[PDB]
Design a protein around this ligand. Structure first.
Ligand SMILES: CC(=O)N[C@H]1[C@@H](OP(=O)(O)OP(=O)(O)OC[C@H]2O[C@@H](n3ccc(=O)[nH]c3=O)[C@H](O)[C@@H]2O)O[C@H](CO)[C@H](O)[C@@H]1O
Ligand SMILES: O=c1ccn([C@@H]2O[C@H](COP(=O)(O)OP(=O)(O)O)[C@@H](O)[C@H]2O)c(=O)[nH]1
Lengths: 364, 365
């Protein structure tokens, strides 16, 4: 009856990790024991989950991961399960949840060990002779996987989103908003930008900050940014110092009260360099928080489609971002429309049901 | 605060009160309200975002445990305020009461005992003209009994339509679910399955059903079996089954979640209750096209009459009239096919589903 779930890292504050957790909980609800193999588990263990932290070690993450596989398989050979579900690419998965973009594609934007390892493990899932079922959440990547490996179409299953319910604006949103802004010292005429999620460099924190720096006087004195993620802030503190933004930027470690931030803020800014999907984009949306996002993000189309913010087309130019941010912030009418647009869309679209649909496919 | 407090003595997945509560609560949640629950026990899964508080109060007498419960709850509430308080049992401090029970005071004629005084006192707590509790009704029949005993103001009552879940309706593959089920339990084409569904076997008349299975003509009795489904102890009934010789044709099962399989696999729902506020499973049979044999005391029995989806036995109850009726309904396969068809058609035209949305509408203003 047991399901073995594999991922390299569990922590509470990542997209891959919250997806794994919500799927796993649902399979358990459905009457399954839950085994989990991992290199690290931070935060609570739900009741009934057997969590196996692997004792393997290397000065190279790529080799560490190869050892991890052999370790896992050695345990699984001795203790069989019904099905093996992996959230990272490696051999021996029955199902793969594609929480990462296509590696081989990204590479081309040879001889090195890291390249051959990560490409080797991708092919391990996506090769035509592999029997791994693939759970897709970014539509855009499927054709890239097929271009590079020729994976069969029958093997792919596109899931809708799995935003948790707590992210949806509550009936007392105005009260949550006022309490939050009272707490952080934000007045009616202050503007809060929030940049949410770990991976500050990849999600374009540097771009956000330049764009804050380049706002016209009247908007600049009114604007502050809070970034929320596990990353080392120190590489950005130097940027923040250079640009004179000490008094109007803060960077916080990961935390579980993201919905309060979503309600208290005036804009989600997310000018990612690259992103498989971007759960927070939609989390902003169901909170009624306008989004500024680049078009490379897999979930960007939802912002354009619900008219709940602006999507900045490629190629990225700092100058365009600057302009777009200033214009979204000058336009209080536009912002009100995008909040209401987001909330209404949240009431239509299936943005929630990914875990049940993911459970269906794993279980049959 | 947007929190709604929901109060019920017992949550478990396999009761009418409990399922109505779950569905109202999920609807209110989906409209942006966090859900807190006060209860003496909670069995089964806990939906995402639901704060369940299991009260630590204890007494030898249920009625006194209940009074300690109320005090425990009010203490939590006064320290942690909510938007609105909705109860599924009658007690003080309710903004809203959902009447999953019949009128007690009326049933107490069917003075000094502490049990009586408590339940009467908690019912008056809701229904008195000075209480402000709004009442959500599901059995229309009880509203005048309440006004008779308490003088409750008309405007405080709001009659809701039924709240049958979508999954009880015969689906597209009904015949395949039916055939699969009857294969599993070993039922041939000429076998006839009576089902009796709900915890509370005594009140729901399992003794009467059993007598009636026993009194069938040899030829039918040979072909007929009964499955009862609920949480009760089977022990008292296993003496009756034996004493009537019914060992090899009666099974009693614990609460389960696959009730629709049974409704599709059965040949008759039998439900000769002594009393019953409404009776959800009566409409579940109906929307599965399972014909029903029901006493007229059940508040949903009329739906069986109005839809011609089975027969209703008039009060006063007489065992031998039940016997006659069961025999008649089983003997007549064309009438049973007609009651089935009648059930499915009535389900396609009637408002049997929208209770949770209407209840939420009244709770939220
Ligand atoms: C005796 C009595 O006064 N009962 C009341 C109580 O329902 P009861 O639980 O007494 O009976 P009911 O037939 O109204 O409700 C049973 C419900 O539980 C379900 N079920 C039952 C058995 C099982 O194994 N699995 C399962 O899911 C069944 O399919 C239905 O959805 O509350 C109802 C709704 O609030 C009405 O007020 C009923 O009149
Ligand atoms: O401090 C934090 C940062 C992020 N998150 C959640 O982590 C997920 C991040 O997923 P996303 O797709 O935005 O980014 P990824 O981590 O996959 O790059 C979302 O549910 C965020 O709300 C969180 O709970 N706390």
């Amino acid at each position: 009856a047991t399901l073995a779930f594999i991922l390299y890292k569990y922590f509470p504050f990542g997209g891959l990790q919250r997806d794994f957790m919500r799927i796993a909980l649902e399979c358990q609800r459905r009457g399954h024991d839950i085994r989990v193999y991992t290199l690290i588990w931070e935060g609570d263990v739900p009741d009934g989950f057997e969590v196996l932290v692997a004792p393997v070690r290397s000065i190279f993450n790529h080799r560490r991961n190869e050892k991890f596989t052999a370790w896992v398989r050695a345990d699984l050979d001795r203790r069989p399960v019904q099905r093996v579900i992996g959230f990272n690419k490696m051999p021996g998965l029955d199902v793969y949840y594609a929480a990462d973009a296509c590696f081989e594609e990204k590479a081309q934007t040879r001889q090195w060990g890291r390249y051959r390892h990560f490409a080797g493990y991708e092919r391990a899932v996506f090769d035509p002779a592999s029997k791994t079922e693939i759970l897709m959440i970014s539509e855009v990547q499927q054709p890239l996987f097929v271009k590079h490996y020729g994976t069969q179409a029958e093997r792919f299953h596109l899931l809708p989103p799995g935003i948790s319910q707590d992210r949806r604006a509550p009936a007392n949103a105005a009260d949550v908003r006022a309490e939050f802004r009272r707490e952080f010292g934000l007045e009616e005429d202050d503007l809060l930008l929030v940049q949410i999620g770990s991976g500050f460099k990849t999600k374009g924190l540097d771009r956000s900050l330049k764009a804050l720096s380049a706002l016209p006087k009247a908007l600049r004195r009114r604007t502050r940014l809070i970034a929320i993620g596990q990353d080392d802030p120190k590489p950005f503190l130097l940027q923040i110092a250079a640009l004179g933004l000490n008094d109007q930027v803060q960077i916080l470690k990961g935390r579980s009260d993201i919905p309060r931030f979503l309600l208290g803020a005036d804009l989600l800014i997310h000018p990612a360099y690259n992103e498989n999907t971007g759960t927070v984009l939609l989390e902003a949306l169901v909170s009624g928080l306008p989004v500024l996002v680049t078009d490379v993000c897999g979930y960007a189309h939802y912002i354009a489609e619900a008219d709940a913010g602006r999507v900045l087309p490629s190629p990225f130019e700092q100058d365009s971002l600057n302009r777009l941010l200033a214009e979204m912030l000058e336009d209080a009418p536009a912002r009100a429309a995008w909040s209401r647009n987001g909330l209404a869309y949240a009431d239509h679209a299936d943005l929630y049901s990914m875990p049940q649909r993911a459970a269906d496919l794993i279980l049959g």
